[PDB]
Nucleic acid binder design. Structure first.
Ligand SMILES: [K+]
Ligand SMILES: [K+]
Ligand SMILES: [K+]
Ligand SMILES: [Mg+2]
Ligand SMILES: [Mg+2]
Length: 136
RNA sequence: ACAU
DNA sequence: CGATGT
């Protein structure tokens, strides 16, 4: 504890896992939706969580914002730290789009710098992350 | 087991 | 119940 309210919170939403994947980022303090990705026909929860963080990094950098990012995903936080999304999802024609986006997100991480702290949202203490889709 |  | 991940 406690919550850094001056922050950006991100989350994935899906229909199936693997299944249709989307994500969004919100102002933690107000819940204002700041970005939303068009649904991607097949992906995994963790791919979406990863893309959401990287999109947040790009969004904040473009706006010269030093706010931290909250994610509830232990997995995605680690993938971003490593600059490598270690997904098990088969690479085939059906999954080409999500894998293109993941590949491109890794590529962005490997060609840009950032100081943005990427913080674990402590769901057990604070409840659902403010970017949550409310589907569970 | 923990995080989804 | 099923799945994705460390
Ligand atoms: K949800
Ligand atoms: K959660
Ligand atoms: K498991
Ligand atoms: Mg989440
Ligand atoms: Mg959620």
């Amino acid at each position: 504890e406690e919550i850094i309210w001056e922050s950006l919170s991100v989350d994935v939403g899906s229909q199936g896992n693997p299944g249709i994947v989307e994500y969004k980022g919100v102002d933690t303090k107000t819940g204002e939706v700041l970005f939303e990705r068009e649904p991607i026909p097949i992906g995994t929860n963790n791919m979406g969580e990863f893309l959401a963080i990287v999109h947040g990094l790009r969004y904040l950098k473009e706006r010269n914002s030093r706010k931290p990012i909250y994610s509830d995903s232990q997995t995605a936080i680690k993938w971003v730290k490593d600059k490598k999304a270690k997904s098990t999802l088969v690479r085939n024609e059906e999954t080409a789009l999500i894998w293109k986006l993941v590949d491109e997100a890794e590529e962005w991480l490997n060609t840009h710098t950032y100081e943005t702290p990427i913080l674990k949202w402590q769901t057990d203490k604070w409840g659902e992350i403010k970017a949550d889709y409310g589907r569970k």
